[PDB]
DNA sequence: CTGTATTTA
DNA sequence: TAAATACAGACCTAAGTCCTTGAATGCCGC
DNA sequence: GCGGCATTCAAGGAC
């Protein structure tokens, strides 16, 4: 309505003849959502000669700068899940993804140098091309499946929570371990599982006293015992092992702790 | 008082026990201490920027200069020493440093004028200026040029490049030279005689050779050797081999075995020997340095081999400087120079 | 000396919409709006020195006549960007009673509107909505993206573009005619060339050249006003042989006092906006210039790093 | 049995006799003692040696330690919580439990013990995680207060330690115990703990499965005693920590199939490994060393793999996002093969 | 007394006739302030080229001996904020002078540090209050200034001082002090300056202190070199010559002995060698590419520390490998 | 050695509170005839010139001229450490450094010794202004402060107009306008209430509001203030003290 | 992009 | 039940300073 | 004893 009111003052009639200059001077320059940014950045037509002439590199940097907090994360998440259309003659998908990941590593180094001391924020344009534009250009093409949102935030939060839990466990057991956090995680835990959980599986409900004694020797707790079993992965995942333990044993152990 | 201080110095490590107190105790940095002594008779100290390798004695030199200038009484009233352990952001530089520079110099007493020159300016020492942010450095830049009448600024750093160009332009640049055997053998000999360190002929020179232009590390090495010899009580002299054993220097036979493994051997044997070698916990930098010395010094390899070995050693040293895993870098070095 | 005279930017600042040589379409739209009244809410955007502040000032003057003093609230948005300002002063001016002609409205000018804080920008929406029948808002900014989308939703959008060489030349010739200045065609071409579509910069350069040398000739203009810095850098990267690029870097840039950080930033900007070479070459060149810029920003900035930049770019161009 | 049978003095140490003699020499005069930096392979027992050195310098009450809680404020007005191990003669600080706020806990608290104080020992555990700003802050603090505060920094690698820090303290290397010495300690442990061995050689094999680590050796022995019910036979299986098997499966997947579809699975494995309190440098080291052990590859592949591992180790040391570099390393490895 | 200040501050120019190096700028500025047309100035240039000195001399010439009161001088050591702009700069521009009648002057020294918001608020203050006050922006770097602020001021690019002007300044200093300089020593002094008079004055006072005598002697190239620690040209060519044709062992020994005889720095020799080879006529560009890349990487690695002997051998090997392509 | 002994300790506090907001740093020049001080605002819009003669001091001894560079934000706190019934003593050694302030009670026995570190202000302050003005008026300080604080709310600019036996303060802002008109009258029943005016030429010029609010903060010293205006000249706001005076040379706005 | 909510065919 | 299009998935932390901005603290005035 | 205003500081955001 505002456009109609402003333009009709001079051009009493608006037609198909002048619509190009009407739209070109009234384009909605809004910051695209990170999903649309990832979709546009991973478009194989954009990096073609016609696309490069139309959508120049400055537009690519502006697209990155529309949301510079999530564009590198999305690009790193879903650059290896696109079917390429700009592969050089004699280059496979694996080579392009490897070069893209190398540029991703360079972009991450630049980002660390930016978001650290000395506040090298003038390097932001560099982080525009190293993290997003170049890796997308290496593996540009069509979207194979769906553009998944970056999972690095969730894994980071999970790792931080697990690190906090490990910090509590290590500071509880420091009286006996005299070993660092990583040293207790890598080596102490595969033995702690066998000292605590294995007797429940192999002896029934009569091994509660031994486990309680072992845990009180290292000042271990019920919440600490629950957190210990959540650290193991791979062939040793306790998410189903505890459920296989009879509920009577768990109730007796909880009563003994209480 | 003085007796308590002398006792405390006597019960302190040799690094601080023999810290220079006067400008004469600075042995090798003659070109800087000459200017510092000449400006003592005058009162035209400029802004100074000390830079050089660690352990060359910039902090000791500036402390001795400030002592000789102000005396033990005004040393605590006309000196503002800010280290790398203090907050030095923009707010700190604008508030504390600027207010101190704006303040007038403290009035010296009657005893100070009779024995010390007592210049009408005060000194703000800013040790380890590398960690200072560049905008704080610009605040320092414009602080050091308007109040120069009553305050003198002395930056001390390890890498001159970390300081902005205009700041290095306003301050007179003093480069502290690497303290190798030639210019520090006198100081090491004096220190050894002051502690009755009975050593062999080529021990102190070997100590400075392993030091690689660092008198602090050489002093610590001599101290450790002295304690090791005094514990034994055998009454013999410290040997060079005993010095390099506890200095982290790989023995010559192990180095020779490494050379044979690189020369003749495939990837598997080299990897096995590196895996066994890292068990002894040798420092990677020392191993790379010893490989460099052996390869460059020995005149049996072709020049084209020498170019590539030098470049590979440089690359590995640069990678190891930035907090990398020693075993991986050493294995990469050995494999890359094995294909040569 | 006792006093100075008004600069030609201010002395010959247009006071009517006809004296502006900017975009003909938007200027005619503004003239029609002023003639008819009922000025709508607007944001004018563009590059510095093309006639954005002047256009809105003359529009407000022509629209309000003698009532400009009590009907125009002109505030530099960067000067007053607090939400409290919008809450109190702008609101009070909006609710202020004023008997105006039946086609004229009170005008709120917000100069440098791109610097307003988010809080004031959001608070302005209901202020402009509830008093839209007696108070009108005209924003003047350089970047429309800095203004929130709802704020742009309620107003006309006027994208000013770079002035053509003909309009700048016509305004310059009018100024010379009104000032009686000795000039040369080459001098005016040089002034336009170093103006880069900024009328204010062209006028300032012309006035400074007249005050310093008296004759507007190409030699004098290039003596007092240096050629555009990005063009030397653009010539430097686009050299065919490494020797020529090193020579330009040594003579035109390094020996003339240009700092290393300025050189690397200019190279980054030129390669970003370059179009002669392909996309992959441009991205790889930006990679190398960014690596060198990372090296410079640590204080390693010397001539050797820039020489390495040019050598590595020429290796890249060497297939 | 990692703490049940552990030496408490210098005379109770049972390997590296030259190192024990050097410690005794350094502890003969404890008042004239420089700052110490104990470096060597992880799991060697250098913390036990520093504790024994402290027990030699002071009375036997050094091991009677307590855990206290201290609250600090950073530049963002945050409440950083530090758990500190204290003793009536020394205290231990581990700045590795937080992020970039190490310098803070470095500068203030040490001043607090430097201004309160013939000396009180300070043990910086895991000095590798110390940020360069924290090391710079420690640089002058180590020299200004040398008559009241002495540092004993324990690290597994001096590569991240800056040069001034190295020069300002004496350096002591702790070589990993030999397989014979590790076997002797294992024999003593199994004799005291009543563990049945049909042949001694089993213990020896544990040493060859520990790569010189004593902590790993004892914990693996404890892992072995529970499957075999306190009696170890000739073919007792070697129990590896779960992350080792995960990494080994990752190497098998890498050497078996090479594509972006497998790259996604490797990404998932890396995310799972990283989310469970495991450093990226250790992941890279173990992954590269298991990749090198694959007999299918030739020397041309192994040289490229080790070159990429070193390059991406440099990236990771200069980076902050672990996956952002681990994925690149695995992608380049897939490219090489 | 002025005898107490260092030579860097003792010899600060007080009038526009003592500001050497810049001629096309100084005469234009003098004409601007004599004819009255003084626009808003932007002095962009390297450190020590004489921007603050010339603006102070201009303000002294315009206002007299009471410069320190009629001119508002804001700098990086100040708050440089947006609120400080809004209050101080606006009040100074809007009000009149307390001591005399005339336009006012605001010198924003080192205004590259100024925040983007501050410059955004300032770009309207300069344009509005332009009939009674002027703005002068001094900057070492121009990229830190927004283009809108960049286009409101007349730009003067301060160039590094050429041979004749800095030579004249050293002549003035040797007139003021009971000092003499050797011609070759003066040439080396100019070469080691890179257009920075601050460096020249600092090292000149340093060698005056170094002379150790009451100054009946002359300062030769030896005094300058042993005071500033720069390599001699003779040692530079000797090191390069030993690297170029002599044997690896002999070249390494020569470099070590040159660098340890006078305690020279590797970076200084590297920069001297880069400067020296810049005149070498090379048939192809691949050798130059390799030389530049390897030397720049070596310099960057030196700027962070490491093994010094390894770095020197790396320089030797890089030069030899680069020139091995010149066959 | 400078040694000054005041009659009342609150008189110096009242003097310093006048400079508290408009001035940061001052250079006290101490001579045999009294203490002089001149300062310029951070924005360099107003100039403060204080002179206190030897009459205000119960005791005075100045062997040689002394320069005392000091910060007001600390001296205000130091003087606030005294009492209403105390006496103040300024001590400075031969070399100017760390001025000492002594508070002594006359009813009881108490010693309050405070120190202030001096600062070196390089800019000298010795200029004196002696020029005839177009108009010289005198009005009670309380009334002038009331008008200033009343009209400062309307706008940030206050215009003063002196016309034939008419004194006008105009303040036009965004919320409205205001005008206060006074006539010079002589009050025989109380002399400190009357308003005097001697004009040579009509004056009309505008000041900033906040600087006027800062100057009127000196009304706690004298009950009557003199205001001197001239064309193209700074305005002189003078509070006359018992031994000397305090004058603000405040600069108008460009038209 | 897949996937889903909404509108119109 | 299909076309036809909109259009939603998701929000990070340490860090450095500057800026805003609400709200509490602090003081003076009455 | 409130009433009002000014100052300061902490929380979030931006680069
Ligand atoms: N030139 C010297 N003459 C005599 N002793 C020296 C000299 N240089 C270093 N030392 C010794 O080394 C100790 C340490 O010197 P420092 O001045 O701290 O070294 P540095 O230059 O400050 O290195 P940093 O602090 O890491 S930058 C001194 O206390 C002396 O014992
Ligand atoms: N052209 C010149 N003529 C004479 N002396 C000069 C000249 N340029 C610099 N100097 C000397 O160098 C000193 C410092 O110069 P400044 O003008 O302060 O440096 P600058 O040009 O402002 O650059 P900065 O301060 O790093 S932004 C002066 O006090 C002079 O002694
Ligand atoms: N189209 C134009 N015609 C005439 N003069 C112009 C034009 N554009 C800019 N100017 C000159 O530039 C000066 C200020 O320009 P201004 O409109 O403030 O720039 P901006 O558009 O960046 O706000 C004015 O004095 C005016 O004379
Ligand atoms: N001299 C020794 N004899 C026997 N066991 C030792 C000796 N020194 C250390 N250990 C073993 O090492 C374990 C402690 O290792 P620790 O010091 O935490 O590893 P790290 O050296 O990585 O810090 C103890 O459980 C102890 O059994
Ligand atoms: Mg030091
Ligand atoms: Mg404008
Ligand atoms: Mg300057």
Numbering used by the authors:
A (entry chain A): 518 to 775
B (entry chain D): 14 to 353
C (entry chain B): 4 to 322
D (entry chain E): 4 to 120, 134 to 353
E (entry chain C): 9 to 335
F (entry chain F): 1 to 255
Task: Copy text verbatim from the article accompanying this structure deposition.
Clamp loaders place circular sliding clamp proteins onto DNA so that clamp-binding partner proteins can synthesize, scan, and repair the genome. Here, we report the discovery of a second DNA binding site in the yeast clamp loader replication factor C (RFC) that aids in binding to nicked or gapped DNA. This DNA binding site is on the external surface and is only accessible in the open conformation of RFC. Here, we describe a series of structures that reveal that RFC has a second binding site for DNA on the external surface of RFC. This external DNA binding site is composite, consisting of three domains of Rfc1: the (BRCA1 C-Terminus) BRCT, AAA+, and collar domains.
To elucidate how RFC binds to gapped DNA, we determined the structures of RFC:PCNA bound to DNA constructs with 6- and 5-nucleotide ssDNA gaps. We chose these gap sizes because we predicted that the 6-nucleotide gap will bind without the need to melt much duplex, while the 5-nucleotide gap should be too short to bind without melting DNA or altering the clamp loader structure to accommodate the shorter linker. We determined the structures of RFC:PCNA bound to 5- and 6-nucleotide gapped DNAs to 3.0- and 3.3 Å overall resolution. We find that both structures exhibit the p/t duplex bound in the internal site and the non-p/t duplex bound at the external DNA binding site. In the 5-gap and 6-gap structures, there is clear density for a single-stranded region of the template strand that connects the two duplex regions. The ssDNA linker interacts with a series of mostly conserved residues from the AAA+ (P461, R464), collar (P551, F552, F587), and A′ domains (F666, L670, S674, R681) of the Rfc1, with some additional contributions from the E subunit (S79, R81, N104). The ssDNA region traverses the same path that the template overhang does in our structures bound to p/t-DNA. The ssDNA region in both the 5-gap and 6-gap structures is 6 nucleotides long, indicating that the 5-gap DNA must have melted at least one base. Indeed, for 5-gap DNA we see clear density for base-flipping of the 3′ end of the primer strand in the internal DNA binding site, similar to what we previously observed for p/t-DNA. On the other hand, for 6-gap DNA, we observe scant density for flipping of the 3′ end. Neither the 5-gap nor the 6-gap structures show any sign of base-flipping at the external separation pin.
